[PDB]
Enzyme design. Structure first.
Site, PDB file in Angstrom:
ATOM      1  N   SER A 199       0.810  -1.224   0.000  1.00  0.00           N
ATOM      2  CA  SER A 199       0.000   0.000   0.000  1.00  0.00           C
ATOM      3  C   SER A 199       0.850   1.285   0.000  1.00  0.00           C
ATOM      4  CB  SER A 199      -1.061  -0.055   1.104  1.00  0.00           C
ATOM      5  OG  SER A 199      -2.180   0.763   0.763  1.00  0.00           O
ATOM      6  N   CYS A 233      -3.341   9.286   6.305  1.00  0.00           N
ATOM      7  CA  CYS A 233      -4.444   9.008   5.408  1.00  0.00           C
ATOM      8  C   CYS A 233      -4.602  10.143   4.394  1.00  0.00           C
ATOM      9  CB  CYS A 233      -5.735   8.807   6.213  1.00  0.00           C
ATOM     10  SG  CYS A 233      -7.091   8.274   5.174  1.00  0.00           S
ATOM     11  N   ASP A 258     -10.187  -5.658  -3.720  1.00  0.00           N
ATOM     12  CA  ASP A 258      -9.510  -4.846  -2.722  1.00  0.00           C
ATOM     13  C   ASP A 258     -10.330  -3.583  -2.606  1.00  0.00           C
ATOM     14  OD1 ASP A 258      -7.847  -2.780  -1.599  1.00  0.00           O
ATOM     15  OD2 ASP A 258      -6.054  -3.881  -2.183  1.00  0.00           O
ATOM     16  N   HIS A 269      -7.270  -6.562   0.930  1.00  0.00           N
ATOM     17  CA  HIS A 269      -6.193  -5.587   0.812  1.00  0.00           C
ATOM     18  C   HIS A 269      -4.983  -6.051   1.600  1.00  0.00           C
ATOM     19  CE1 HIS A 269      -4.324  -1.647   0.494  1.00  0.00           C
ATOM     20  NE2 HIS A 269      -4.260  -1.524   1.810  1.00  0.00           N
TER      21      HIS A 269
END
Length: 264
Positions: free
Chosen positions: A93, A187, A214, A243
């Site tokens: 990620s 984030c 995902d 994910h």
């Protein structure tokens, strides 16, 4: 400094070095089930991102870490400190983004990338399907501020995807340990990152791992990466969803890692 602060660990042995770099909401413990498949054959470097709950949060400089370049700086400093001249890098990620940037800054150092849960841009754009809209993320950010615990409780099972309660429990454990202001800030940083224009600068061969669903990476993203990454790129498919396959399907992920890390 950094080797202690970011909990750097070197385990296994070999001429083939591989770095495992975790994603949002986890720490290096996320790799614990895949790790035994790698250490007989490779020297493995693990570390925590500065935003991990397992790092003292008073190291988190909000100014400095306003973009992913600062995370790349940490990674490069760790590898330079350990005197490693050449490695393969596995990133999940946000760490897939870090790996891409780091392979462009130092193409000498990165012999191969394996990118899990990976996207160059999460927000939609004209004829680009990232998976997210601005209004949606605004609400995400408000929820993270208004009631971080409730947000995390809801997010964990959606990220895991498959009904694998032990993986939900484990991801929740580390998510709940992120300091909420840091969480929100990371984030926000990830959602402002757009690596589309620099993909062609990657010279390393790349394996993109695609699961069957995902929540944060549409099915079309992997073909996009394969089309635009500047190295020799393949997409490898796992036969399950989520994910976080290193938590939910580690045995299956380990097969892809062993093959991807065989020669580089």
């Amino acid at each position: 400094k950094l080797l202690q602060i970011l909990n750097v660990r070197v385990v296994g042995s070999g001429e083939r070095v591989v770095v495992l770099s975790h994603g949002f909401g986890t720490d290096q413990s996320a790799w614990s089930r895949v790790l035994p498949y790698l250490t007989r054959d490779h020297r493995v470097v693990l570390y925590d991102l500065v935003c991990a709950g397992s790092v003292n949060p008073d190291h988190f400089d909000f100014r400095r870490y306003d973009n992913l370049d600062a995370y790349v700086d940490d990674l490069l400093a760790i590898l330079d400190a350990l005197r490693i001249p050449r490695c393969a890098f596995v990133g999940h990620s946000v760490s897939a983004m870090i790996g891409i940037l780091a392979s462009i800054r130092r193409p000498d150092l990165f012999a191969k990338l394996v990118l899990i849960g990976a996207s160059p841009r999460f927000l939609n754009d004209s004829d680009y399907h990232g998976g997210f809209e601005l209004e949606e993320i605004q609400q995400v950010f408000d929820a993270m501020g208004a009631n971080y615990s409730a947000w995390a409780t809801g997010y964990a099972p959606l990220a895991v995807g498959a009904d694998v309660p032990a993986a939900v429990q484990e991801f929740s454990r580390t998510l709940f340990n992120m300091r909420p202001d840091i969480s929100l800030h990371v984030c926000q940083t990830v959602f402002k990152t757009d690596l589309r224009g620099v993909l062609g600068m990657v010279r390393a061969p790349c394996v993109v791992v695609q699961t069957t669903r995902d929540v944060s990476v549409p099915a079309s993203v992997a073909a996009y990466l394969k089309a635009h990454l500047g190295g020799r790129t393949t997409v490898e498919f796992l036969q399950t969803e989520g994910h976080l396959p290193h938590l939910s399907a580690p045995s299956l992920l380990a097969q892809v890692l062993r093959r991807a890390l065989a020669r580089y």
